[PDB]
Amino acid sequence: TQNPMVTGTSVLGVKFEGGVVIAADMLGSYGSLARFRNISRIMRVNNSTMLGASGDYADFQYLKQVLGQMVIDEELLGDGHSYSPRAIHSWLTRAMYSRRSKMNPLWNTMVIGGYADGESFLGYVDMLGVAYEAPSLATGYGAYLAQPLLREVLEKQPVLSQTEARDLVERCMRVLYYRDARSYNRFQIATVTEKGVEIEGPLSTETNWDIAHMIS
Amino acid sequence: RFSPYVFNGGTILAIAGEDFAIVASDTRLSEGFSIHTRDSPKCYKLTDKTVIGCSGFHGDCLTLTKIIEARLKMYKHSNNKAMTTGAIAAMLSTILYSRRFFPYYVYNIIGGLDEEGKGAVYSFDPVGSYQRDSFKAGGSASAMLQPLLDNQVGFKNMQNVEHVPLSLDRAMRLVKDVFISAAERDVYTGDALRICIVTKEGIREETVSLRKD
Amino acid sequence: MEYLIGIQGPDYVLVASDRVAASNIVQMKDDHDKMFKMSEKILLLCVGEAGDTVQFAEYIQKNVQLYKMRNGYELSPTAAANFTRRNLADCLRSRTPYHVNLLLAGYDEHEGPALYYMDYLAALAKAPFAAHGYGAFLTLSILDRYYTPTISRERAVELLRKCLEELQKRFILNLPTFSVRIIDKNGIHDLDNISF
Amino acid sequence: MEYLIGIQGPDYVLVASDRVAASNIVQMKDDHDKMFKMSEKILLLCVGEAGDTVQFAEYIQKNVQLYKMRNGYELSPTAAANFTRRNLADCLRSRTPYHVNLLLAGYDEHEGPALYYMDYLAALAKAPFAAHGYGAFLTLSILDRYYTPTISRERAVELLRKCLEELQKRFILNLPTFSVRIIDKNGIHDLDNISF
Amino acid sequence: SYDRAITVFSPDGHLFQVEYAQEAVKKGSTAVGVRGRDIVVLGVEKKSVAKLQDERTVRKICALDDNVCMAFAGLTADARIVINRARVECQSHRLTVEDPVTVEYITRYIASLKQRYTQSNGR
Amino acid sequence: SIMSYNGGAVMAMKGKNCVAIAADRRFGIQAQMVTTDFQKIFPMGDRLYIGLAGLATDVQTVAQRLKFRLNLYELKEGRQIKPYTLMSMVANLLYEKRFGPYYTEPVIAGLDPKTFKPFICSLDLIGCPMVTDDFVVSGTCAEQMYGMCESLWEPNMDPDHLFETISQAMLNAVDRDAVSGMGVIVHIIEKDKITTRTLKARMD
Amino acid sequence: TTIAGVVYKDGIVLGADTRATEGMVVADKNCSKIHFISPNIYCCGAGTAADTDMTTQLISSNLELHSLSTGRLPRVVTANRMLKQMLFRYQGYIGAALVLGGVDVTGPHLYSIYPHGSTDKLPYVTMGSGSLAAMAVFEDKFRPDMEEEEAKNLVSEAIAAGIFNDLGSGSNIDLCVISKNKLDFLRPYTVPNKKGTRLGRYRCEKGTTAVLTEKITPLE
Amino acid sequence: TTTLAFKFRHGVIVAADSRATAGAYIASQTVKKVIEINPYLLGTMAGGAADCSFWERLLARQCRIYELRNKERISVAAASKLLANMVYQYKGMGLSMGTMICGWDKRGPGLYYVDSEGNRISGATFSVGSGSVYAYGVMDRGYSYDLEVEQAYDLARRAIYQATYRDAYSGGAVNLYHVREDGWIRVSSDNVADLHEKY
Amino acid sequence: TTIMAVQFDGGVVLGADSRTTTGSYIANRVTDKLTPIHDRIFCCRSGSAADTQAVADAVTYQLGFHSIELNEPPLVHTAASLFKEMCYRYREDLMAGIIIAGWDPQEGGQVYSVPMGGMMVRQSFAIGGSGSSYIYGYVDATYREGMTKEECLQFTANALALAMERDGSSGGVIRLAAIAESGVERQVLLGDQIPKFAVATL
Amino acid sequence: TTIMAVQFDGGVVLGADSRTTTGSYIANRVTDKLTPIHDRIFCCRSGSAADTQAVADAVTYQLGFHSIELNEPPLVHTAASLFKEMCYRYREDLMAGIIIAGWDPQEGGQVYSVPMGGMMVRQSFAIGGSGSSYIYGYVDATYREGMTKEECLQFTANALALAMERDGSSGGVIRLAAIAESGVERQVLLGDQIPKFAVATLP
Ligand SMILES: [Cl-]
Ligand SMILES: [Cl-]
Ligand SMILES: [Cl-]
Ligand SMILES: [Cl-]
Ligand SMILES: [Cl-]
Ligand SMILES: [Cl-]
Ligand SMILES: [Cl-]
Ligand SMILES: [Cl-]
Ligand SMILES: [Cl-]
Ligand SMILES: [Cl-]
Ligand SMILES: [Cl-]
Ligand SMILES: [Cl-]
Ligand SMILES: [Cl-]
Ligand SMILES: [Cl-]
Ligand SMILES: [Cl-]
Ligand SMILES: [Cl-]
Ligand SMILES: [Cl-]
Ligand SMILES: [Cl-]
Ligand SMILES: [Cl-]
Ligand SMILES: [Cl-]
Ligand SMILES: [K+]
Ligand SMILES: [K+]
Ligand SMILES: [K+]
Ligand SMILES: [Mg+2]
Ligand SMILES: [Mg+2]
Ligand SMILES: [Mg+2]
Ligand SMILES: [Mg+2]
Ligand SMILES: [Mg+2]
Ligand SMILES: [Mg+2]
Ligand SMILES: [Mg+2]
C-alpha cells in the first residue's frame, strides 16, 4: 500500500494476572466517512494468540489470510509444537520490515496479545518493523489518549485482575469515543487466558453529555 | 509519500579500560513526542567477550542485531571458533556497507575485550566507516556526553593533572554522571540507564534509574 | 570573480585588486579599477554584484567627502568603516540591499594604519591582512604562513606577489594584472601594476 | 572548460588541446594530454565529463588496436570515426551514455588528411577545421577569417597560435599551455607545446 | 542449451577427449620454436604447398599483440578461435594494467581457456 | 542554518557574589575563518555585560542599537540600568522584529548596580527571556555546552572556582564544534573588579 | 507544554508544567507558564513563547487601563475579546494558544483561545503538546461542582499525565487557584522530577586552565 | 579534511589531518586518513570516510590477488586504474571519494589522484579535501622536486597545519608518511596544538 | 460540522451538531454553533471557527447599531445581507459557510444560506457543513411543504442524527432553537434523546 | 456513478444509474453498469470504466473455468473472493469500487462490497460510487430488516433517484436487476418512471 483506503483507528491492550485483553472498535473509515460500521479488527490467531490491527483494513485482511493459513499448515503436522505468541510477533516483525524494505508497506499498526506457559505476552509491530513489548499498548490516537491512563493505573498497581483490566479498557474506549473523530461506539474486547481466546461484542460505552449545559 | 525511516531515540556509550570494557545505554524508546516503552535497552550481547550498542531507527536496530547473530553462528560453524571483537567489527563494517544506497539507520558502538584481554571500543557510522577508540558516545545525547569524556578521560584542556589509568570504579561513576546530565537536557534520554561491564570473568549488568519526564 | 587583498604593516596598508571585468566567458576590460578614494588617507575596495558595487561605493564616497566639507576635517578610517557598515546593515533587510564585499584601508594620524573587512551581510572585522573572492581561498594561507605584524613595505610587496603568482599557477580564472596602492601618513600612493 | 582545435591542410591535420585538468576553482594538473593515439595515423581528442572521457576514448582505442591485430591492417580515419559514432549513438539512449565531445584527426594513404567533429549526441561532421569548448566561441571566427584549403603547415601553426593568443587575451579561464601534434603520411609528430 | 558432459574420466584416470585432442595435434603440420640469445624463431611445415594457394591466407604464425606471437599445430579452425580470444585479452590487459602482457601472462590465459574446455558441459 | 553561517558560542554562569561570561573568538564564513579576535561580549555597565552568538552582522547591530537605547535610558533616568531591566529592554528590541528577526540569541550576565546580587539570563531571537540560577548557553554547540555545564556547575562557587568551571565548560564544548573556537575570552564580574582573560586554546 | 484548566464549585483551577524546549533539547526546566492578566484573571500559555509572553503582557496592560478607567474589577469576557480580536487580526501568525480563567461579578469563567482567534467557553480545557494526555484525565475523572481540593488533585493529575507521556513537557506542576475570596498562585505545586546525584567531583583547582592574557580592572 | 601528497627526488610524501565531522559536530579527531593499502602503496581519505575505506580495502584485496597470480607487485598506474574502474560504475549514485594513490614501482615514485567523479590523473603534487585550497597555497610556494628529506617533511607538515587553521572541517593531528623505494614509513604524528606552539 | 434550518408558518427551526475538530482530534465535543445575532435572528456556523466567530461578532455589532438607529426590530434579510457583504468581500480570506435564520414582523420566518464564496439565497430549508453531504437524499425525500413547528424540530433532529453517524467531523449533541414572534426556545438532545437508526447487522 | 445492492429472503436486488462522464461531458448516458459474471452472479461497477470492465472480464473467465471444473454453480462468495484477490493485488494500478451480488444454492442471496483498496465485506445492503455520499442518510433511515423483493426494488429505485438528482456524475436511467433461484429479471426505469421528489420551492 502506498495510499491507505478503508482504515481502522486505535487498538488497545493490557496485561493482567493470567492473561491479556485487547480492544478495538468495529469501524472502517474512508477518510472522514464512517463507512463500514460492523467489521472486526481482531483475529484469533491460535489458542494462545490474538491480534488487533489499526490502519488499512485490506492489508489487515491479507495478513489474516496469510497468518490463518500458516496456523492451519502447522496444525496439519500434529507434531506437538505450536507457534507461541512471541513467535507470531517475531514473524510479523519480519514480514512488516521486509515489506517496508521493498518500499511497499502493509499499512498497519498491530497489537499481539497472548498467554503461554504461565506468561502474558503483549507486543507491538508497526508498518516499518518497529516492534517491542510492554505491559500495555495503544496504537493511533490511543497512544495519546489511552496510554497515559493505562500507564498511570499500572504505576499504582502493576498487577491487575482480569476484571480490573477489563474495566480500565472500557474507560479508555469511552475516552477515545469522546475525543477521536474516527472512532465509533461499537467495539469488541478479546481476552486470552489459559482457556484460550474469547472475542466479545458488539459492545458500547455509556456516555455522559452533562457538559453540554455547562458552557456558562 | 511513505518514509521507510523514523527516529526512535537512544543514547549509547562505550569505554575501554586496561582489562574491561563498558557498554551503556538508556532504555527509552521514543517516536515523535511519545514514549513507546520505558524498558527497551540498546545493548546486545554478541559473545562472552563482546557487546554492541545500537541506536537510531528501531526497525533497523532489530533487523541488524538479528543479522549479526546469524553471522556469528555461521562463522563459528565454518571456522570452529567464536568471532573475536575485532573480526565482529570488520564484519559489521561490510554488513553496513552492503546497504550503502539504502542504509541501516543505526549508530553502532562495539565494546569488548581484544585478544590480549584488553578493553576495546569500535565506533561506526551508518554505512560502516569505523575505528578503534578509547571511549565513544553515540546517539541522541552524544554531543552532550562526548565533551565531558574528552575532558575527564582524555584529560583534555587540563594542566598540572597526572594522566592515571582509568579504574573501573571511576569509569562507572563517569558513565552514571554523563547519563544523568544528558537526561536533564535531551528529551529522548531517560527512564533508566543499563550498564554492561565486560571483563575476563564475563558480562555483568547494572541498572540505574533516570528521570521519567 | 574578483580578487581583493590587503596587508597592514606597522605604518602602512597595502592593497591590491585584479583589473578584470568579466562577463560570461569573456574579459570585457583588462584595466578595471576596484578601488575608490574616500579621502586623502582612505581607500574602499568593492566587489560583488554589478550595479550594486559602484552604486554603493560611490554613495559612501560622496557622503565621506560631504562630511569633510561640512566639518572641515575628515572621518577617521574606523569612523568611515562603521559608517559603511551602518549603511550596508540598514539596507540588508530593506527593499534595496547591496550585494557587495569590501575592504576598507586607511591611515589615521593618531591610530596608524587600519584594514577592515566586510561581507555583504555587513559583518565588520579589523584584520592585519584579508582577502575577498575565490582567489582568497588560495592566498590566505600564504599570508598566514609568511606574514608578520612588522613586515616592511618592500617585503610586503613580495608577499603580495607570492599571492598573485599563486593565482597564476593554481586558480582556474585568467587574472593577469593587478592594481596596487599603499597608504601611509603621506596619503595614497599608486604603485606599478603587477602583471603577468 | 577544455579546448580542442583541429586544422586540415592539403596533406596534414594539425591538432591542439589545452593541458589543464581543473576541479572547482583549481587547476590540478598543467601537463594533461587530451589526445589518444588510435593507430599510426589517427588521433582521437576527447573532452567532457570526468570518467566518461577516458573510459570512452580508451574503449575506442583498444577496439581500433584489436581490429589491427585481427586483420593485419588499420582502420581508415573515416571508418574509425564511424565506429566511434556508432558506439556513442548506440549508448545515447542506454543506461550508460557517455558525455564526451570529440575530434578525430587522421591521414589515409589513399584519401589524405581528414578531420571529424563529434558532439555528445553523436552527430558526426567532417570539417576543414573545428573546435570544441567555450574557447571555440572565441576562435572559430579567426579560423573562418584566415583559413584557406591550401594552408601550409608553417602558416597553420601561426593560425593556431593566433587562436591560442586570443584565448589568453579574451577568455576568462586560465589556459596557459597547449599540446600540439600533426599527422601526415609519415605518422603522428609531436610539436613543441605552445605556452604562455 | 546443450549440457552433455563431453570430457569425463575413464577407468585408468584417463580423459579420453583430451587424449583425442592431442591426437589431432599430432596430425597437424610440424611447428618448431627456438629461443635464441636476443632472438626467438618460429618455423612451421606449410601444410601443402598447392601452387594455386594464396599463401598470405593460411599462415600458421600469428601476432597476438606487438610483442607476442604464436604458432600452433592441430585443427586450424580451433586455433583461429583461440588466437582471436587471446588477441581480445591482450587489449583488455593493456586497457586495465597500461602495460603490454608478458609472454607468460598470455600463455597462462590461453592455457586456462583450454583447461576450461576440458571441464565444461557441452563442449 | 542561518544561525550556523558564522558559528560561535557564548555562555554565562552564576557564582556566590559573582558572575562569569565567556565566548569564542572566531569570525568565520561557513568553513573559512576570517579573524580570530572577534568581539561577542559587550559592556552594558560597569558590572553588566551582554554576549551575543549568531549571525555576526546582527551580533554587531543588536549590540550597537542596544547601546543607543541604554545610553538614552541612563541619561534620562540618571541611574545605571538593573540587570532585569536590561533583559526587558533587549526583549522589546528583539520582539519589534518578530516578523523579520535579528539572528542572535543573547546572554546577559551581571551584578545589580545597587545590591550586587548576581544575575544571568538568555533570550531567543524574538525576545523570549529565560532567567536561571546556574548557567545559560547560546550558539552552534549548545548541546556540548549543556553537557559540560550540567556536569561541572555547582552552587555558590568562589571567583577562582567559577573561572575554572566556565573555562573548562567552554574549552571542551567548543573543541567538539567545527565552527566555534579559535580562542576563548572570559570575564569574571565581581563587586570591586572585572577580571578579563583569554585562554590557551586549540586553533583548529 | 501541558496546560489545563477546570471550573470547580467556587472558582477556577489552572495548571501548567514548567519545561521549555528548543528543538528536542530542554532550554528551561522552570519556565512560568501561568501569566497574570489581572488580580482576578490568569492565563496559561502554550505555543510560541515570545508570543504568549508579549500577548498576555499587552492584554494585561490594556485591561489595567480599562479597570483604572472603570473603577471596576475586569471581566473574563473582556480579556477573551481583546485576545481573540488581536489574534484574529494577525491571522494565526501570533502563535499564542491560551487557557484563560478568572472570576468576575458574574462568577467563574474558563476559555480556550487559539492562535487564529477562535475561542471556546468550557468547563475544562487543555492545550499544548501534552494536551491529549491531560484531556484523557479530565474525560475520565472530571465531575461538575468539584470541591477545591478535588479540583486541584484533578488538574495536577492532568498536568502529570502530560509531563510523563509527552516529550515536550516536564519538570514541575504549577497551579493557580482563583475564587471570589482568594488567589493561590502555587509555583511549584509539585516537583515530580529531580536531577540524579553527581557521583564524581570535577572541582578544578586554580591553574588547571592555562591562561594567555589577563587584565584586572578595579571598580568603585 | 585536508590531505596532500607530492613526488620528489626521494619518493613521495603523504600527509593528512585527522578530523571527521557530522554537520558542524566534530565526530572524531583521531581518524587515520592515510590508508595503508599494502607495504608499497598508500591511499588517502577525503570525501566519504566509508567510501574511501571500503573501496581502498577492496583495492588492497585485488592488489594481493594480483601479486599471487602474477608473482610481482602491481604498478601504481595499474593499482590506481583498478580503483578508478571500480568506482566508475557507481557514478551518479552518491559515492564521495577523493584519494591519492602513492607508491614507487619500475617507473619510480608514483602519484595518482582518483575520485568518485571518474577522474584519474598522474601528477607531481596534489591536495584533496575541504582544506585543499589552503594546503595548495603553502605547498605550492615551498615545493621543489629537489627538496631534502627533512625539508619535504617540514613542508607537508606546515601545509596541513595551515589548512587546519583556516578550514573549520580540518584539524586534530598531522600524520605524515614517506614512500621510499623499499616501502613506506610512518614519519610522524603531531597534534596541531603542539605544532601551534612550535610555528 | 452539520448545520440546518427550516421554515414554518410563524418561525424557524435551527440546529447543529457540537463537534469541533483539529485534524481528527475533537477539541470541543459540546460546541455551540448557533449564535444569536439579535433578539430573533441566529446564525448557524460552519467552516473555520475563528472566521465564523469573527464575522458573527462583527455583524452583531453592525446590526445592533442599525437597529438602535432605526428604532425597529431588524429584518432577517438585513442580517443575511450583512453576512453576505462581509463573506463576499473577504471571500479570499475566509472559510465560512453560514445559515442565517430568524423571524421579523414584516416577512415572518426566514432562512438564508450564505455559503462559501458569499452568495446569498433564501430557502425553505438549508443544510451545510461537512456532514450535509450525507443528508441531501434524506432531506430531499423527507421534506414536506406545510410542516408544523413540532414536525420541523423532529425533521432537523433526524437529519442531524443521520449526518452525525456518518461524518467523522460531526457529532456530540444536537443543539436546536425555534424562533417565532413569541421568542427563542433552545434545547439540547443528548445521548438517548438523539434519534437512533439501527446499524444494518447480519 | 451510483450503485447499490440489497439482500432479501431468496435473492438480491441490484441497481445503478447510467451516466459515464469524462470530466463533465457525458460520454454515455445509457451505460449498463450491472455486469453478469455468471448465471446468478452480477457485479455493479464504479470507478474507472477501463479498470472495472477489464477486471469483470477476467473474473468471468476465472469463475467460468472454475465452475466447469467443479461441475457446480459457483458460490457468490467465490466470485467476490476472485474480485477481491485481483482488486487487492493490483490496488496501486486500479480505480475500482465493486459490489458483487447474487444467489447460490448454498448461501442464498448475498451482497459483497469490494471497495477501492480491495477489502471485502458481506453486507445486508451496499452502496457505492460518487453519488453514494448523498444517500447514506436516506438508506440508513429507510432500510428495514425483512424487506420483500418488491419493497427492495422500490428502495433501490428511490435511493438511486435521490443520488442522481444531486450528483453531477450520476444520472440518466435506473437499471435494476433481481436475482433469485428462478433467474435474473432486468428492467429500466426511465423518464417519468424514475421516482420524483419535488424541489422545495418557496411558499
Ligand atoms: Cl460493515
Ligand atoms: Cl478471528
Ligand atoms: Cl599498454
Ligand atoms: Cl534601534
Ligand atoms: Cl467573546
Ligand atoms: Cl506546546
Ligand atoms: Cl591521528
Ligand atoms: Cl588479478
Ligand atoms: Cl595522467
Ligand atoms: Cl573532505
Ligand atoms: Cl616549510
Ligand atoms: Cl465554534
Ligand atoms: Cl459552504
Ligand atoms: Cl455551508
Ligand atoms: Cl464544516
Ligand atoms: Cl463530538
Ligand atoms: Cl446520463
Ligand atoms: Cl470505493
Ligand atoms: Cl464504491
Ligand atoms: Cl464513481
Ligand atoms: K530526558
Ligand atoms: K460522527
Ligand atoms: K445528476
Ligand atoms: Mg515529558
Ligand atoms: Mg538588488
Ligand atoms: Mg553517466
Ligand atoms: Mg571548535
Ligand atoms: Mg580547522
Ligand atoms: Mg484566516
Ligand atoms: Mg489504469
Domain CATH for D130 = 3.60.20.10
Per-state percent for chain B, helix, strand, coil, to nearest 5: 30, 35, 35
Contact in structure between C103 and C36 (CB atoms under 8 Å): no
User: I24–A212: do the CB atoms touch at under 8 Å?
Assistant: no
CATH number for H81:
3.60.20.10
Please, which residues bridge with residue J176 across strands? J15, J187
- The experimental method, as deposited, was X-ray
Nearest to J125 among I139, I143, I200 (CB): I200
Our CA angle for C29, C30, C33, nearest 5°, is 85
Q: How far is C7 from chain H (nearest CA, A)?
A: 17
I40 Cα: distance to centroid of ligand 22 (angstroms): 30
User: G217–F198: do the CB atoms touch at under 8 Å?
Assistant: no
Name the closest ligand to CA C51: 25
Name the closest ligand to CA I95: 29
C96 Cα: distance to centroid of ligand 25 (angstroms): 6
Task: Check CB contact of H32 with chain B, cutoff 8 Å.
Answer: yes
DSSP strand E in F74-183: where? 107-111, 118-123, 129-131, 135-139
Name the closest ligand to CA G129: 6
Task: Please tell me the distance from the alpha carbon of residue C164 to that of residue D93, in angstroms, as a whole number.
Answer: 46
Which helix (H) or strand (E) covers residue D160, if one does? helix D153-170
- Which residue of chain F is at minimal alpha-carbon distance from G202? F152
Question: Greatest CA span in chain H, whole angstroms?
Answer: 51
Helix (H, G, I), strand (E, B) or coil at A65: helix
- The size of the D-H interface in CB pairs under 8 A is 31
Contact in structure between J74 and J38 (CB atoms under 8 Å): yes
Domain span at residue H89? 1-199
DSSP code at position J93: G
Cα-based distances in Å from D179 to B5, D33, D43, D51? 53, 7, 13, 21
Task: Check CB contact of E63 with chain D, cutoff 8 Å.
Answer: yes
As for how many domains chain B has, the answer is 1
The catalytic position among G1, G2, G18, G56 is G1
Contact in structure between F9 and F140 (CB atoms under 8 Å): yes
* Chains interfacing with E (3 or more CB pairs < 8 Å): D, H
- How many CB atoms lie under 10 A from the CB of residue J89? 12
Cα-based distances in Å from B16 to B123, D185, E58, F147? 12, 74, 75, 21
Q: How far is J119 from chain A (nearest CA, A)?
A: 4
CATH class of F1-204: alpha beta
Contact in structure between B25 and B45 (CB atoms under 8 Å): no
Domain span at residue D160? 1-196
Tell me if there are at least 3 CB pairs under 8 Å linking chains F and I.
no
Q: Helix H segments across E1-123? A: 16-26, 76-97, 103-116
CATH number for A180:
3.60.20.10
As for how many domains chain A has, the answer is 1
- Which residue of chain H is at minimal alpha-carbon distance from F141? H25
- How many CB atoms lie under 10 A from the CB of residue I123? 18
Label each residue of G57-105 as H, E or C: HHHHHHHHHHHHHHCCCCCHHHHHHHHHHHHHHCCCCCCEEEEEEEEEC
Q: List binding-site positions of H for bortezomib.
A: 49
| CA-closest candidate to residue A8, choices A71, A80, A83, A61 | A61
As for how many domains chain D has, the answer is 1
Task: Check CB contact of I25 with chain G, cutoff 8 Å.
Answer: yes
User: H75–E98: do the CB atoms touch at under 8 Å?
Assistant: yes
Task: Please tell me the distance from the alpha carbon of residue I17 to that of residue I45, in angstroms, as a whole number.
Answer: 10
Residues of H within 8 A of D21 (CB-CB) are 119, 121
- Burial (CB count <10 Å: 0-12, 13-18, 19+), residue H196: middle
User: H54–B93: do the CB atoms touch at under 8 Å?
Assistant: yes
Name the closest ligand to CA H90: 26
Contact in structure between D81 and D118 (CB atoms under 8 Å): yes
Tell me if there are at least 3 CB pairs under 8 Å linking chains E and J.
no
* Chains interfacing with F (3 or more CB pairs < 8 Å): B, C, G, H
Contact in structure between D167 and D139 (CB atoms under 8 Å): yes
CATH number for I133:
3.60.20.10
* Chains interfacing with A (3 or more CB pairs < 8 Å): B, G, I, J
User: A214–G165: do the CB atoms touch at under 8 Å?
Assistant: no
Task: Please tell me the distance from the alpha carbon of residue J107 to that of residue J114, in angstroms, as a whole number.
Answer: 19
- Give contacts of F 151-170 with G, CB under 8 A: 151-152, 154, 160-161, 163-165, 167-168
Domain span at residue B136? 1-213
Task: Please tell me the distance from the alpha carbon of residue H5 to that of residue B66, in angstroms, as a whole number.
Answer: 43
Q: How far is C122 from chain F (nearest CA, A)?
A: 5
The HSE-up count of residue H139 (CA atoms within 13 Å, CB side) is 32
- Which residue of chain I is at minimal alpha-carbon distance from A144? I25
Task: Check CB contact of H149 with chain E, cutoff 8 Å.
Answer: no
Q: Helix H segments across B80-187? A: 85-97, 142-152, 168-185
Dihedral of the CA atoms A111, A117, A119, A120 (nearest 10)? 30
Residues near A15 by Cβ (< 8 Å), separated by ≥ 6?
Answer: A120, A122, A135, A136, A160, A165
- How many CB atoms lie under 10 A from the CB of residue B37? 17
Task: Please tell me the distance from the alpha carbon of residue G18 to that of residue G26, in angstroms, as a whole number.
Answer: 10
Residues of B within 8 A of F175 (CB-CB) are 147, 150, 156-157
Q: How far is G25 from chain F (nearest CA, A)?
A: 8
Q: Helix H segments across C2-132? A: 52-71, 77-92
User: For F12-30, b where at least 16 C-beta lie within 10 A, e where not — what string?
Assistant: bbbbeebbbbbbbbbbbbe
| CA-closest candidate to residue H132, choices C160, C138, F5, D29 | C138
Resolution, rounded to a tenth of an Å?
A: 1.8
Task: Check CB contact of B151 with chain H, cutoff 8 Å.
Answer: no
| CA-closest candidate to residue G13, choices G132, G97, G102, G80 | G102
| CA-closest candidate to residue D99, choices F35, F15, H92 | H92
Task: Check CB contact of A26 with chain J, cutoff 8 Å.
Answer: no
Q: Cell numbers of I158, please?
A: 433526524
Task: Please tell me the distance from the alpha carbon of residue C155 to that of residue C165, in angstroms, as a whole number.
Answer: 15
Task: Please tell me the distance from the alpha carbon of residue C62 to that of residue I189, in angstroms, as a whole number.
Answer: 79
As for how many domains chain H has, the answer is 1
User: C134–D25: do the CB atoms touch at under 8 Å?
Assistant: yes
Task: Check CB contact of E84 with chain D, cutoff 8 Å.
Answer: yes
Q: How far is C187 from chain D (nearest CA, A)?
A: 34
- Burial (CB count <10 Å: 0-12, 13-18, 19+), residue I65: exposed
User: E98–H70: do the CB atoms touch at under 8 Å?
Assistant: no
For chain G, domains (ranges, CATH) are 1-220 (3.60.20.10)
Task: Check CB contact of F142 with chain G, cutoff 8 Å.
Answer: yes
Residues near G58 by Cβ (< 8 Å), separated by ≥ 6?
Answer: G86
DSSP strand E in chain A: where? 6-8, 11-16, 19-25, 28-30, 33-36, 42-46, 49-56, 108-116, 119-125, 131-133, 136-138, 187-193, 196-203
Q: How far is D109 from chain E (nearest CA, A)?
A: 22
Please, which residues bridge with residue H121 across strands? H113
- Which residue of chain I is at minimal alpha-carbon distance from J144? I200
Q: Which residue has the cell 566555534?
A: F180
A207 is an active site residue = no
CATH number for B162:
3.60.20.10
J188 Cα: distance to centroid of ligand 19 (angstroms): 22
- Which residue of chain H is at minimal alpha-carbon distance from F180? H168
Q: Which residue has the cell 542561518?
A: F2
As for how many domains chain I has, the answer is 1
- Give contacts of G 76-105 with I, CB under 8 A: 84-85, 87-88, 92
G169 Cα: distance to centroid of ligand 5 (angstroms): 30
Of the residues C94, C95, C121, the best mutation for testing chain F's interface (the one with the most F CB atoms within 10 Å of its CB) is C121
